[PDB]
């Protein structure tokens, strides 16, 4: 099929600012290139088609242009309801592919996180299983690492982690990881360490605990 | 007026076909491709298949490898049979029209979408979360959770002091087990003068289970 890149995957912005999305086909396809937009819970919705012409009831603050293999969406006076994920697409020939995506976010100052460590519950380990929880609260840009230690023993393959939205307000983001292990594991070492990387960081933090500390 | 929308099971066992219906309302099945979408998480927007008017011309993407049937049932309604379904077949999954014509907005676009459903491919069944407490070890600022392990299907939602408390929190998006169950942490920050001059409860609603818990976090003490 064509393969349609757009650029960026996401870009931050504020409020009244001018923005920019590409798009790229591998293969020319005239004027036939769509763009929609998207929000968390929320399907396409057909914004432009024939690379310029803007959908019914579309505000005239966006503007789609270009032609060929080289596309580009403006969003002029980025309004709150503007922060979203843009997808272009080209009709020429079926499938009618689509991009990748560029979500816009908000521009927010670089906040490194505050980091917190939880061990597993009395109440869970009545049970045969232990989590363990890092939380990387209120950080900015979202790009993140978390490495988990215990008895310095690096663990790979038995974390999982998520990330929220960013928040309304702060522009931030946050992310708790979980480490599983089981009950028998975790009674048997002491030491459980948390190590966070982050642009905000001049190096790493790590927030750590004994087993049993109050 | 004319309206789609998507219908049908929410959750298909692997190796099982998956099937689904999209209800054109307002308008009926007419001259313009019936399309089948969809967006698995993480992925872009892909084409299905389509089918041209009422029993017309389909064309299917081979991208999901000759497994698509696409057909016009009613007047009203058209399907989508998708046969031997893996875990990367999870998707949202919409239905929309092709707008064929040059007099109207949309030409040569998906002018036209349902809301879209969300089909997962699991052979887990519906089971309610227990839920932990979140308390660090004893700057300001305290940090207290609810973990709410071990349920399925999606979703869990999680208030925190029945409403009353919405500054600080964080409830993340759930990550999947390898035992086929769902996990999912819920924060707050508050001030830590706040630790003694407050009780704090996350109230865990699993609809699918209607299992709800209110569960008191308190936090640890050196004393």
């Known amino acids: 099929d064509i393969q349609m890149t757009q650029s960026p995957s996401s870009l931050s912005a504020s409020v009244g600012d001018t923005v920019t999305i590409t798009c790229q086909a591998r293969h020319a396809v005239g004027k036939n290139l769509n763009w929609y937009q998207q929000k968390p819970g929320r399907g396409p919705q057909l914004l432009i088609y024939?690379?310029?012409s803007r959908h019914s009831g579309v505000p005239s603050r966006f503007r789609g242009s270009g032609s060929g293999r080289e596309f580009t969406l403006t969003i002029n006076n980025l309004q709150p309801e503007d922060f979203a994920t843009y997808s272009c697409?080209?009709?020429?020939?079926?499938?009618?592919?689509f991009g990748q995506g560029t979500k816009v976010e908000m521009k927010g100052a670089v906040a490194a996180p505050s980091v917190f460590i939880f061990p597993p519950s009395d109440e869970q380990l009545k049970s045969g299983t232990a989590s363990v929880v890092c939380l990387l609260n209120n950080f900015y840009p979202r790009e993140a690492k978390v490495q988990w230690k215990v008895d310095n023993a690096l663990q790979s393959g038995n974390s999982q982690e998520s990330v929220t939205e960013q928040d309304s307000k702060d522009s931030t983001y946050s992310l708790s990881s979980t480490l599983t292990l089981s009950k028998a594991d975790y009674e048997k070492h002491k030491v459980y360490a948390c190590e966070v990387t982050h642009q905000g960081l001049r190096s790493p933090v790590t927030k750590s605990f004994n087993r049993g500390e109050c | 007026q004319v309206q789609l929308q998507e219908s049908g099971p929410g959750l298909v066992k692997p190796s099982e076909t998956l099937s689904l219906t999209c209800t054109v309302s307002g308008g009926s099945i007419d001259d313009y491709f019936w399309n089948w979408v969809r967006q698995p998480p993480g992925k872009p927007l892909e084409c299905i298949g389509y089918?041209?008017?009422?029993?017309?011309?389909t064309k299917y993407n081979p991208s999901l490898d000759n497994r698509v049937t696409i057909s016009t049932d009613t007047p009203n309604q058209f399907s989508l049979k998708l046969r031997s379904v893996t875990v990367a077949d999870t998707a949202i999954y919409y239905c929309?029209?092709?707008?064929?014509?040059?007099?109207?907005?949309?030409?040569?676009?998906?002018?036209?979408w349902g809301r879209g459903v969300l089909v997962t491919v699991s052979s887990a069944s519906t089971k309610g979360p227990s839920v932990f407490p979140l308390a660090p070890s004893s700057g300001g600022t305290a940090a207290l959770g609810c973990l709410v392990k071990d349920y399925f299907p999606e979703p869990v939602t999680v208030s925190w002091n029945s409403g009353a408390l919405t500054s600080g929190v964080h409830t993340f998006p759930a990550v999947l087990q390898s035992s086929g169950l769902y996990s999912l942490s819920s924060v707050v920050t508050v001030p830590s003068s706040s630790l003694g001059t407050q009780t704090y409860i996350c109230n865990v609603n699993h609809k699918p289970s209607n299992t709800k818990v209110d569960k008191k976090v308190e936090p640890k003490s050196c004393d």
């Open positions: 089918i041209f008017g009422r029993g017309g011309g």
């Open positions: 929309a029209r092709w707008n064929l014509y040059d007099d109207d907005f949309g030409y040569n676009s998906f002018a036209v």
């Open positions: 697409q080209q009709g020429y020939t079926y499938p009618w592919t």
């Open positions: 024939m690379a310029s």
